[PDB]
Amino acid sequence: HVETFAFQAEIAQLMSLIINTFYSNKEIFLRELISNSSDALDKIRYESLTDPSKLDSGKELHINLIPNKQDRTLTIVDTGIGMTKADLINNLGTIAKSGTKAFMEALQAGADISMIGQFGVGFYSAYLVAEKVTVITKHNDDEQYAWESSAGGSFTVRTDTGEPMGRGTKVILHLKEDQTEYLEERRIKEIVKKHSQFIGYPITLFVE
Numbered sequence: 282h283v284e285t286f287a288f289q290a291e292i293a294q295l296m297s298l299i300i301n302t303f304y305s306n307k308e309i310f311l312r313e314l315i316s317n318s319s320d321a322l323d324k325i326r327y328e329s330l331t332d333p334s335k336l337d338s339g340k341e342l343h344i345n346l347i348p349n350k351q352d353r354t355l356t357i358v359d360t361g362i363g364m365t366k367a368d369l370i371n372n373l374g375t376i377a378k379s380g381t382k383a384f385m386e387a388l389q390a391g392a393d394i395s396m397i398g399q400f401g402v403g404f405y406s407a408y409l410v411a412e413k414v415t416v417i418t419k420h421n422d423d424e425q426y427a428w429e430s431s432a433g434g435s436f437t438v439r440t441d442t443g444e445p446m447g448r449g450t451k452v453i454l455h456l457k458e459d460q461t462e463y464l465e466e467r468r469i470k471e472i473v474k475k476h477s478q479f480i481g482y483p484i485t486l487f488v489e
């Protein structure tokens with residue numbers, strides 16, 4: 282039972298700017314996602330200080346980077362707070378709608394694309410490198426869901442029949458054919474050390 286939702290107008294505009302603009306410096310996509318996982322780990326750590334039962338779905342707080350040349354994907358996996366179904370459909374768009382307008386208004390005035398994080402929309406930097414993004418995510422309060430979009434103004438949501446994951450977010454990045462460099466162990470190490478040396482959680486880079 283796959284449901285299809287149109288992106289709010291503003292967001293669909295952002296996602297295009299990212300997909301079509303000439304920007305050579307695409308590696309920022311990673312520290313954004315990694316940063317995003319970190320914020321998500323942060324939220325659960327804190328919540329669990331008052332509710333130790335919130336960690337009954339996973340005590341380990343970590344980020345994994347999992348490259349896959351075969352199915353041409355880079356995945357960032359976190360055991361963060363994860364996203365309820367309302368997050369995916371309603372909430373995160375409402376935050377991101379203001380987030381975008383600010384980001385966009387700052388783009389003439391001469392800020393660049395790498396400052397996307399300060400505007401609350403780093404997630405979308407994933408489109409600098411991916412042709413389609415899939416998001417597996419599990420919140421304590423809701424069931425497990427698959428979100429997915431290849432942009433073009435729309436995105437789907439479905440309850441997921443995959444491996445259960447206790448709690449977290451997987452972000453599967455289905456890379457564009459000219460972006461397979463973000464699949465290489467040495468290349469990933471370089472961006473992690475360069476942009477994310479001071480993340481507060483173990484980032485394991487998997488090898489093949």
Ligand SMILES: COC(=O)c1c(C)n[nH]c1-c1ccno1
Pocket residue numbers: 369373374377401402403404405416428450452
């Ligand atoms: C996991 O991907 C996301 O976080 C997401 C979705 C599914 N919609 N909007 C957003 C978002 C994140 C940050 N700003 O927006």
Ligand SMILES: CSc1nc(C)nc(N)n1
Pocket residue numbers: 314317318321359361362363364404450
């Ligand atoms: C609320 S959970 C979340 N959110 C984001 C933007 N990212 C991640 N990894 N998790």
Ligand SMILES: [Mg+2]
Pocket residue numbers: 343345485
């Ligand atoms: Mg591990």
